Ligand binder design. Structure first.
Ligand SMILES: Nc1ccn([C@@H]2O[C@H](COP(=O)(O)OP(=O)(O)OP(=O)(O)O)[C@@H](O)[C@H]2O)c(=O)n1
Ligand SMILES: [Ca+2]
Ligand SMILES: [Ca+2]
Ligand SMILES: [Ca+2]
Ligand SMILES: [Ca+2]
Length: 341
DNA sequence: GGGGGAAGGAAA
DNA sequence: GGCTTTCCTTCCCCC
């Protein structure tokens, strides 16, 4: 394989500096306003002028404003970034039939029937970047390599607005020098567990006894890291069909009172069905986040499609099961639909 | 022993 | 804090 990875730059914030060009140069910060007080929520994304100062995905909208109090804070327009994204995706579908849409702003292209070497791959990349810049004035980064994992890593290294290749020789250099915590699919929890085992690089997984890896991070993530360490990782570029869709809302104030909860839940279901659009789900899950923020969720799977009426009736049953089996207060309430048809 | 599953992770 | 969507890793049902 010769994989080609695209990763739209500071995406949500770009798609904002593209419908109001006056923003370029100024720090922008797309936030998610939760709804329980002046500026409560978090930062979705922030253009690079804002990151230079500490504002990044995650930190509360309130820390953001303490750091860059005079920045352009805008609310999240997800339905809008979603379209811009698709339009771009469609642009990429021409450069190859084998495409995997990883996220709302990440796509893997398998161009192993579209080019011959990394020099051709690299040129196809630039061609792509440009096309995108031409049609939607959106810069994106490109990473090319022998599999999805190293193509992604490539882009991680080149973003923003770049292009790169980690040829067969580099891969071995990396399997040895790349901080394993920088490997796609390894976060803080698993990173720590691996640091405790002396595993700081990929190559470090071939030495540790296996079953003592399966023991600490999980059978799957273990297999994952090793195959990568053996330069034997090959996950095909497969079309991805969305598997779930949901919406959680945040209540104006905590409670365990079913009738105080009901309005928000029914409000989330509605919005949830608007999204589904033609998709019929056979499984519904009610999700609530206790005052302490842990995540409780009860579900049920049907042997047929779920009609709102059903979603309505059944979701109350579920919600109840939560209230009956958890004594904590609720602040967040929502739903989620799976097992489409 | 294991193939095929509802809930709480763990990462993006 | 912090959506939204993933895989998963357990605790089962039953071969
Ligand atoms: N905690 C996060 C991380 C990411 N995103 C969103 O996910 C998409 C891209 O992911 P990410 O790479 O994390 O954000 P970017 O702003 O695109 O940063 P960069 O260009 O450096 O990758 C963005 O459109 C945004 C989000 O809502 N919340
Ligand atoms: Ca991105
Ligand atoms: Ca991304
Ligand atoms: Ca990453
Ligand atoms: Ca990491």
């Amino acid at each position: 394989m010769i994989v080609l990875f695209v990763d739209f730059d500071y995406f949500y914030a770009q798609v904002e500096e593209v419908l109001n060009p006056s923003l370029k140069g100024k720090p922008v910060v797309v936030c998610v306003f939760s709804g329980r007080f002046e500026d409560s929520g978090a930062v979705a994304t922030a253009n690079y002028e804002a990151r230079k100062f500490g504002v990044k995905a995650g930190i509360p909208i309130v820390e953001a404003k303490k750091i860059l109090p005079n920045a352009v804070y805008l609310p999240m327009r997800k339905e809008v970034y979603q379209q811009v994204s698709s339009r771009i995706m469609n642009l990429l579908r021409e450069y190859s039939e084998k495409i995997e849409i990883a996220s709302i702003d990440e796509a893997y292209l398998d161009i192993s029937d579209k080019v011959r070497d990394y020099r051709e791959a690299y040129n196809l990349g630039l061609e792509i970047k440009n096309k995108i810049l031409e049609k939607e004035k959106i810069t994106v980064t490109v990473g090319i390599s022998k599999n999805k994992v190293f193509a992604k890593i490539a882009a991680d290294m080149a973003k923003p607005n770049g292009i790169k290749v980690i040829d067969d020789e580099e891969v071995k250099r990396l399997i040895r020098e790349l901080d394993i915590a920088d490997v796609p699919g390894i976060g803080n929890i698993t990173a720590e567990k691996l640091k405790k085992l002396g595993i700081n690089k990929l190559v470090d997984t071939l030495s540790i006894e296996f079953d003592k890896l399966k023991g600490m991070i999980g059978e799957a993530k273990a297999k994952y890291l090793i195959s990568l360490a053996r330069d034997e990782y090959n996950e095909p570029i497969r079309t991805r069909v969305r598997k779930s869709i949901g919406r959680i809302v945040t209540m104006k104030r905590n409670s365990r009172n079913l009738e105080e909860i009901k309005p928000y839940l029914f409000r989330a279901i509605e919005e949830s069905y608007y999204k589904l659009d033609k998709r019929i789900p056979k499984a519904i899950h009610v999700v609530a986040v206790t005052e302490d923020l842990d995540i409780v969720s009860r579900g049920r799977t049907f042997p047929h499609g779920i009609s709102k009426e059903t979603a309505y009736s059944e979701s109350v049953k579920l919600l109840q099961k939560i209230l009956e089996e958890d004594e904590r207060k609720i602040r967040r309430i929502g739903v989620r639909f799976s097992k489409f048809i």
